[model samples]
Target: VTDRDRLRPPLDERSLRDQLIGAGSGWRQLDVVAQTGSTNADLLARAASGADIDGVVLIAEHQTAGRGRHGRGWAATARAQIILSVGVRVVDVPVQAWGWLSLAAGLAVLDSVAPLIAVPPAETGLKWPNDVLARGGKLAGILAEVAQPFVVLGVGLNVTQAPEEVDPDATSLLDLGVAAPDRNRIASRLLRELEARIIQWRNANPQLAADYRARSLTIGSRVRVELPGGQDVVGIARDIDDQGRLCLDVGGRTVVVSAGDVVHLR
Candidate 1:
């Protein structure tokens, strides 16, 4: 059967590109496909092959090889989510502040997806380092990687999956009461928000910290962080510092984490 034969038809690529790209737009390319091993991997490979990928966008209908932290597979019904990646070349922002890329992307997703939920929380916003939660479940996720002169951001937003299609702690826009989740609408808005956040990160906006914290589900909660090499530390997330590292209070000592898998403890 053809991809369009499904209940959710294939994305209207022509209309999406026409509406999103052109003069004054942040994106330079929008490459949509029926399937790919990984949008993130594809963009990274292109950049590595000496392609100018500064503002290229690659959207996949299904990711055959995309995986998350700890190698957990990224499984989704074909086209059930917005699976895309953007390649960026950094210049205005300093290297140290690059840590905020994922955080910024998370906020961008929040700005685009939250209004559809029809209400608002610490429980409803974003988990630290770019995880999207809605109706108190994982609605989306962001992966930001640096490769010399480029940053690749991969975002996967759950749109139409049923409760059974996701893990026990996962959710979709439709599941969260968004009657008709328009993939194109959310994708366009998401790209716009991402463009702004990416530029805003260059000048180190005064409100970034506040904005991310305000919409954060990680801060002010007891979180278990699994460090890179396999040590688990439990602490109350105190804050996100100027450099974007998580400040976790572990037994009165402040542990600033640059990267780790965080599980918000209930």
Candidate 2:
């Protein structure tokens, strides 16, 4: 068993593999690497290669190439942030309904980061599917991709990094006057929350969507949705339906956007 306590911040895949194998004896298997083009990318490759690995996790302390949804690059400073990618296989869940995993992960992250930090619950809310925005600043971001039966979930969080290193609109827990947390502790907390939530999600509870909506920050507000043609659609944020889809009331017309970048207009 690998000691997670011995694992340091800015971990590579090998350390993660050892830690995962050593930390959790319940998992089917574990694999880790030191550096990668992207954790998400590597996991997807493993899935594509038909690796029997199930529910494998990939952690890259320094990802040479990491990306978010909509082709956005994710940046991280050495030992200042966490880059996590997890691949899991599920049963009985439709492929199209995988968006919930990202939401579930966001909730998990919020739960994990809250106790370590002093941010009020009201001040922190999930932005749509996976972005954890606090008081309008980007606190954390989640990205999930489907690799057949496996879903690769990527998470980027700022712990000790300065605000300047991240999006100007983002703030880290440390910057919010919260003490910097040990990376190993944070990783363990996140993994625990994720595992619990995934179990609950598989239980087919209908209230999960409702719970996410209750924490919604972009609902029932006048906002502008950026369209594909570089156009803008001004609308009123109505609500996220049971399918986790965003509903916007544009003038008298109701538009449901399945996938698009949303900007909550102030």
Candidate 3:
């Protein structure tokens, strides 16, 4: 097959649904679309309609207007990346702790992609609350937002090529010289990993936070955190609090940041 033909291969939706939905997977419905503006927006609208979509999973082969944190746009080559979102009810979990959902999703992405990395798993780690870093560049990004009764967790993984124009700091599985898996396989593993993490999150498992810290690349590095109020704090990255806030020690003063964009500095 020519390169163009290979890039446009059809996704196996039926096989994905059969493997991801039903019995113990925690996924109620799995839908795959050839193209969409954004899976997160699609799922959010579905949830707002009062449908019983607690464990719904939406996948898009191409996202024309994919969104990222801080109002950024996530663009990728069609059928070359895994762009998907999952909606789940945050039952039994406190609203205050819901901030950890993004962190947990990042951990799930790291876990799903670790084995596929050509290097050791230790080389790949979580970058703060959203991105997964592989070989010192972003391999994936996780975005979590609340849609009333449900929380929508969106993930974009770089499978084939990194977006050099969008982010020079980004890297892809293909760039790491690893055998890139099909989108279906990555989706299956991601959902399962995410399911397990969500269960632990609902239970308020302390180990979840521990695991995140263990795999965190942001910690132990000098960093600059851009706060929501247009203020920036530069300090030594310490640890993540129980609330999933990044604790930074700046000028001998400890500051706990709830939400911000982090830039790791050497």
Candidate 4:
């Protein structure tokens, strides 16, 4: 793998499997390429067809058409970063609780890198719903689609790419002084952390929400959210409630945002 030379601590999938088993997280990995549309699309298609797969992870080396939040095209770079999509089945889970799954995934990513990077927790924050930020720039993002009994989680990280230079708004782990780990290693580490977080989410531990709040970077900050109604609301990002919806304190009225593009302003 080309990324093998760059990743730190190296990724050991076998070791990761053992770790997941130890942690008791249910997940299976599937890596692919040249897939039409996005990995999320494929996962959804499979689930709809009764794939009977739970905690399925899909990784693509190259996506012909990748998408981000708000239907934005995810600029594809061959092997530049990990393009991951995961399918999860939440039995008896109310649709209203879907936001927590996205938050859980973000928290997992944050947890995966928190110890490796020296940046203070405050600098590495979770942008409402599921975007990871470092130093006020995008470090990674998550896009989630929900269907009854299932949800697809998609993620893209700026491991060591110039994608941000083209957009001038993206940032990479390398740019922040963190060495990009080998793709396999990165994947392994990510899966392990994610498996643990998912279990915690399922268990609904008392501290999960508090932990998310503690790791949050956008709370109490003013932000601009592009609502689905074609209008944007600028307000202070108050906090993520127990259900994970970003509560925006707009003019003393706290509004819960279900979906949108969030821009944090200094």
User: Using Cα atoms with residue i matched to residue i, what is each candidate's TM-score against the true structure?
Assistant: 0.93, 0.85, 0.94, 0.86
Ten-residue stretch with the least lDDT total in model 3: 1-10
Per-residue lDDT tens digits for candidate 2, residues 1-266, read 12222323554445444555554443455444556778888888988998844666767666677787877788876556777788777646865566677788888887788766666677677877667877677878898887877788888887766677667887877677765467777776777787777766766567677777777777876777776656777898888765567789987899987666678877
Residue-level lDDT tens digits of model 3 in 1-266:
13533644567999988898877778888888989999998998888888766888888888999998878888777887888999878855788889888898998998897888777666679988868998888899888878877899999998875456447888887778765457677778988999999988888889899999889889989999999879989999999988899999988999999889899886
Candidate 4 lDDT over 114-228, as tens digits, reads 6656676567878787778877677787888865577888888766656444347777677777764456666777877777777777777756788788878778778999898
> Which candidate leads the pack in TM-score?
3
Report lDDT per candidate. 0.84, 0.72, 0.84, 0.73
Error of 3 at 68 (Å): 1.0
Model 4 sits at a Cα RMSD from the real structure of 3.2
Could you give me the TM-score of model 4 versus the true structure?
A: 0.86
Model 2 clash pairs are: 2-22, 13-32, 13-33, 14-32, 14-33
Q: Please tell me which model should have the higher lDDT, number 2 or number 4.
A: 4
List where candidate 4 sits over 4 angstroms from the true fold. Answer: 1-25, 32-36, 164-166
Better of 1 and 3 by TM-score: 3
For residue 167, give model 4's deviation from the true position in Å. Answer: 2.6
Better of 2 and 4 by TM-score: 4
| Candidate 2 TM-score, C-alpha based | 0.85
